[PDB]
Amino acid sequence: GRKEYLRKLKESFIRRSVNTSPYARFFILEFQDKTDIKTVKDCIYKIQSNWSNLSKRTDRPYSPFLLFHGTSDANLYELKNQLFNEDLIFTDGYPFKGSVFTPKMLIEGFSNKEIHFQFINDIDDFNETLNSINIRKEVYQFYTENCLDIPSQLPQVNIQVKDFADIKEIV
Amino acid sequence: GRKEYLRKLKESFIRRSVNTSPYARFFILEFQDKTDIKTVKDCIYKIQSNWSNLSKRTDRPYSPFLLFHGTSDANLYELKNQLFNEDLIFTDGYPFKGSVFTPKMLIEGFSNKEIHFQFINDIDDFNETLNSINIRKEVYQFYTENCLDIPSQLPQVNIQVKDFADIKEIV
Amino acid sequence: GRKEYLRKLKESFIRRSVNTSPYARFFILEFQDKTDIKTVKDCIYKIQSNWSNLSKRTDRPYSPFLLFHGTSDANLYELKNQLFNEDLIFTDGYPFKGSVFTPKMLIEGFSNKEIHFQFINDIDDFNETLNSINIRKEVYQFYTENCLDIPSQLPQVNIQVKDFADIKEIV
Amino acid sequence: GRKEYLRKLKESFIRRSVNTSPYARFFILEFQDKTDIKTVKDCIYKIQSNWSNLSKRTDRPYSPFLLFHGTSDANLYELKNQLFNEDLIFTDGYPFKGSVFTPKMLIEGFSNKEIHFQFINDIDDFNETLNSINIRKEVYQFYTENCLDIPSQLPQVNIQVKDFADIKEIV
Amino acid sequence: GRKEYLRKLKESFIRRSVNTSPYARFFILEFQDKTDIKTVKDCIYKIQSNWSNLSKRTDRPYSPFLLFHGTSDANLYELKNQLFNEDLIFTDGYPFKGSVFTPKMLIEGFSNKEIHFQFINDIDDFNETLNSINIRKEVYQFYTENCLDIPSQLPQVNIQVKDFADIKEIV
Amino acid sequence: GRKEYLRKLKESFIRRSVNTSPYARFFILEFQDKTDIKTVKDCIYKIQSNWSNLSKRTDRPYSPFLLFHGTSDANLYELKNQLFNEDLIFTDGYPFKGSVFTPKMLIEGFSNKEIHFQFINDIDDFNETLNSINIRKEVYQFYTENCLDIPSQLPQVNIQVKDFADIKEIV
């Protein structure tokens, strides 16, 4: 059936235990120009609610890493602005204007409970962040037509959705 | 079967998690002078009970925003007066008589455990409050004849119901 | 099958949640002379055990309101004398002999953990206490041959049973 | 199936809730001098484990009442002696040798955490017991060929079993 | 199939509740010459892990009683020495060398959290212990050719297995 | 179907309880030359997450023992050097450079909450640490083409896998 397509992809590679261990979860989402602003935030909030545990009870907080490609910087910063306005505080390695890429902010924001997720701007920020993370890194890709190139010593999943709307129910 | 339409509207649009995050939830209901006040109150109490967590244990309380359209102000205030008489304390942006619409009264009332929900009198109060809540806002519409226009940067669902009685089992 | 009508009667009108809010629940039962005194108490204890939360953990206690019609006053008091003997303490608005109807005793017994339910003698005490409880009141009717006239501004359900024996498995 | 006769007697007559209220529960088992003591002790321990709540958490303890009939006192006392030897402390209204029947021991033993159940020697002790507990009393009769007479003012169930061995998995 | 034979003797004879009461459970196993000691230790550890509850929270600890027959004393002590080497602390009524059987040592070890189970050397130690435990005792027999003689007043089950390795899934 | 062989391999040998006791669990894995370094780490992390309970709540911590073979030391140390980089702290009985095998470091790391698992370099270190752990030891083998010889006094399972990828969903 139609609903069966979403039912296979949910636990084939994306399956989730009752308490997932705090590893460096990288979520690569393809942002094409046809996909509007609104449904990306519905995916990001679903990514943030599941694969981040920032409750005060635990001592091992973790947050997902978010990567977008195939988009212009105009709507990438436009999406970035509303996420911060809606109190979904993130870090992208640029703590101030005119900063060089500082992955040490991504180090502490992963363990910070007040920072919900982590944004990655481009390819060069993603590869430099990978060397900065020393703990286990798993990278999940949700693409439609274009696939990113990922270094081969990392556990990767590749999921080809119909469009961006099908990503959210998987995650 | 006859319930088969109800399930398609329950779990596919207004699916509910047991630990839903404190979003600015907007509920738009069509009051159109043919449904009685009592059936609206049962829908309002059901909207209150499911989509507000005002327990003393939590640190992130939330309350749903309710807006009615298509009816006169006479039965809108009559519905409004019965809700306050039954100890369902709400706020509507008019803390006193002859007041200008005060959006911040709807703001601490979102985080107030003693304020059960928020009442929106008209579209003009709905649209200007939309610029007041900074956090993510979700709008849920339940309508029988006329669907209200919502600006396109919000996550909206539009559900067409047979009458006002079918809303409360959906929520 | 034969148990099917019990499923058309249990979760379609008298569906029960585990965290039901403290509402003024009215239970109107048709007690006829054919019905034995003993089998009514099995319904009263089932109604009291399900629709009352008098535990010391909560701060919002509630008790059901019970109405009986279609019976003589002699056997109604005979039932009333039994329930007080078995430590099922109730109030009827008559705290002493020769008293007028005091609905205030029914208000305090609703919020009292040591008072298990509330008795209503006839129609006139039902309508007088109807204007006394300010919070939302729901009326549930279980009857075989005579239907009461409940005012239309209250949420009412009407259920037909063959006799009084099937009411307790409904609730 | 062969099991289906046990299923129609499990959930239709002796259905059990996890939070059963402290009622004066009377269990009548028929002793017919051909069942050995061991299966009777297996039935009593199943009755005691399920229908008594003597934990330190609760503030409303309750213990079942045990009645046997149709047998001589030779095996009735001999069964009674083993149950006290296995630290299953009970009361029977005879706290000392040559005592008259004292039902007050069974009322205190009903609410005592250190008294597991209550023994009833005969139908004359049972009727005198019946007028002593004021709270609601239900009688469960499990028998093979002889049925005792219970007053019609009490909620009673009657279960006919193939032999004494089917009683323990009903309770 | 073949696994239906495991189901017919698992849930029908050695069915287990999560809150089993502290009874003096006896497990009688046929140790033949064909059985290796390694398989027996898997069965003994499974007997401990299910039918002993020695947590620090409970106030009623219990431990099973272990009996073996049909084997020589050479491999009985060799099995006995391996169990003590793997920190499975037990007692057998012989607290020192050259001791007479001491049934009281099997008594506190029933209630001792640091004593995991009780070993019984032969027939004469089993019957002598049977007169020492006052509380209810249940005896479970698993054997392949020879069935041990058991006193009739003791509640017992008799289970016929293909070999010793099938015992551990049943218990 | 295809996942049938996975179900025939999962709960029939490597069945897991939620309260598994602290056993000296040995995991022997076939690291042949065709296996990538990365896909072994997914099995090591799955073995560590399931068969180790290093939480601060318990007082009996346990860690799995890992053995690898079928390849040279070039990729065995390269796999070993990565696991220490990702904060998966282990011990192998070689606490310093040029050390003799110290099985005592494996015993303390078994009970150490900050040591996640234990590495075994070869069979010579496996047999030496075999005589060091006094408690019950279980050995689990997962292999494709070579099966090693384990002494027959230990509980062993042998599982043939198509390649190293299916081992992780088995455990």
Evaluate whether E92 touches E76 at the Cβ level (below 8 Å): no
Evaluate whether F4 touches F130 at the Cβ level (below 8 Å): no
**F153 and chain E in contact, CB less than 8 A:** yes
**E8 and chain D in contact, CB less than 8 A:** no
Distance CA F70, CA B26 (A): 62
Distance CA D152, CA D69 (A): 19
Using CB atoms within 10 A of its CB, is residue C155 exposed (0-12), middle (13-18) or buried (19+)? Answer: middle
A97's CB contacts (< 8 A; 6+ apart) are none
Distance CA A79, CA A83 (A): 6
C89 → chain D, closest CA residue = D135
C43's CB contacts (< 8 A; 6+ apart) are C29, C164, C167, C168, C171
**B7 and chain C in contact, CB less than 8 A:** no
Q: Which amino acid is at B68?
A: F
**D12 and chain C in contact, CB less than 8 A:** no
Q: Which two tokens stand for residue D62?
A: 């309750």
Q: How far is C97 from chain D (nearest CA, A)?
A: 23
CB atoms within 10 A of CB C123: 12
Evaluate whether E30 touches E144 at the Cβ level (below 8 Å): yes
Evaluate whether E95 touches E120 at the Cβ level (below 8 Å): no
Q: Which of D135, D153, D154 minimises the CB distance to C87?
A: D135
C30's CB contacts (< 8 A; 6+ apart) are C68, C69, C70, C142, C143, C144, C145, C146, C164
Experimental method: cryo-EM
Nearest-5° Cα angle at E66, E61 to E68: 180
Number of alpha carbons in the 13 Å side-chain half-sphere of residue B124: 3
- What do you get for the CA distance between the two ends of chain D, in Å? 20
**F134 and chain E in contact, CB less than 8 A:** yes
Q: Could you tell me if residue E36 is left (phi over 0), alpha (psi between -120 and 50 degrees) or otherwise beta?
A: beta
Q: Could you tell me which of A159, A135, A160, A140 has the C-alpha nearest to residue A150?
A: A140
C to F contact (≥3 Cβ pairs closer than 8 Å): no
What is the 3-state composition of chain E as percent helix, strand, coil, each rounded to the nearest 5?
A: 35, 20, 45
Contacts of C155 in chain B (CB under 8 A): 38, 41-42
Q: Which amino acid is at E97?
A: K
Distance CA F109, CA F126 (A): 15
Evaluate whether E38 touches F154 at the Cβ level (below 8 Å): yes
Q: Order across the sheet with C156-160: list the strands.
A: C90-91, C117-120, C65-69, C24-30, C137-143, C156-160
E135:D87 CB<8 A: yes
**B21 and chain A in contact, CB less than 8 A:** yes
Distance CA B144, CA B167 (A): 10
Number of alpha carbons in the 13 Å side-chain half-sphere of residue F31: 27
Evaluate whether B106 touches B129 at the Cβ level (below 8 Å): yes
* C67: phi then psi, degrees, rounded to nearest 5: -125, 135
Q: Which amino acid is at B82?
A: Q
Evaluate whether D49 touches D64 at the Cβ level (below 8 Å): no
Q: Which amino acid is at C144?
A: T
Q: Could you tell me which of A25, A107, A27 has the C-alpha nearest to residue A68?
A: A27
Q: How many residues does chain C have?
A: 171
**A87 and chain B in contact, CB less than 8 A:** yes
Torsion of CA A141, A147, A151, A152, to 10 degrees: 80
Resolution in A: 2.9
**C7 and chain B in contact, CB less than 8 A:** no
Q: For chain F, where are the E strands, in sequence order? A: 24-30, 65-69, 90-91, 117-120, 137-143, 156-160
Distance CA F92, CA C93 (A): 80
- Chains in touch with F (3+ beta-carbon pairs under 8 Å) read A, E
Q: Residue with structure tokens 């009735």?
A: D76
Distance CA D83, CA D66 (A): 12
Contacts of A86 in chain B (CB under 8 A): 134-136
Q: How far is E128 from chain F (nearest CA, A)?
A: 31
E118's CB contacts (< 8 A; 6+ apart) are E63, E64, E65, E66, E90, E91, E92, E106, E109, E110
Q: Residue with structure tokens 């601490």?
A: B108
Distance CA C108, CA E50 (A): 51
Distance CA C79, CA C81 (A): 5
D to F contact (≥3 Cβ pairs closer than 8 Å): no
Q: Which two tokens stand for residue D112?
A: 């005592």
Evaluate whether F49 touches F103 at the Cβ level (below 8 Å): no
Beta bridge partners of A125: none
Q: Which amino acid is at C33?
A: D
Q: Could you tell me which of E154, E147, E98 has the C-alpha nearest to residue E129?
A: E154
Distance CA B41, CA C23 (A): 13
Burial string for B120-147 (b: 16+ CB within 10 Å, else e) reads bbeeebbeebbeebeebbbbbbbbbeeb
E to A contact (≥3 Cβ pairs closer than 8 Å): no
What does R_g of chain C's alpha carbons equal in angstroms? 15
**Helices within D15-141 (DSSP H only):** 37-50, 73-85, 104-110, 123-130
Helical axes A38-50 vs A73-85, angle rounded to 10°? 50
Give the mutation candidate from F25, F59, F136, F152 for the E interface (greatest E CB count, under 10 A): F136
Nearest-5° Cα angle at D9, D7 to D10: 65
F44 → chain A, closest CA residue = A136
Evaluate whether F118 touches F67 at the Cβ level (below 8 Å): no
Q: Which amino acid is at A97?
A: K
Q: Residue with structure tokens 């070869």?
A: F122
Q: Which of F21, F135, F153 minimises the CB distance to E38?
A: F153
Evaluate whether A129 touches A150 at the Cβ level (below 8 Å): no
Contacts of B20 in chain A (CB under 8 A): none
Distance CA C55, CA D113 (A): 21
Q: How far is E85 from chain D (nearest CA, A)?
A: 35
Evaluate whether C66 touches C120 at the Cβ level (below 8 Å): yes
Beta bridge partners of B156: B139
Torsion of CA B73, B75, B76, B79, to 10 degrees: 160
CA dist list (Å): F36 to A19, A49, B83, F73? 28, 33, 66, 14
**F152 and chain E in contact, CB less than 8 A:** yes
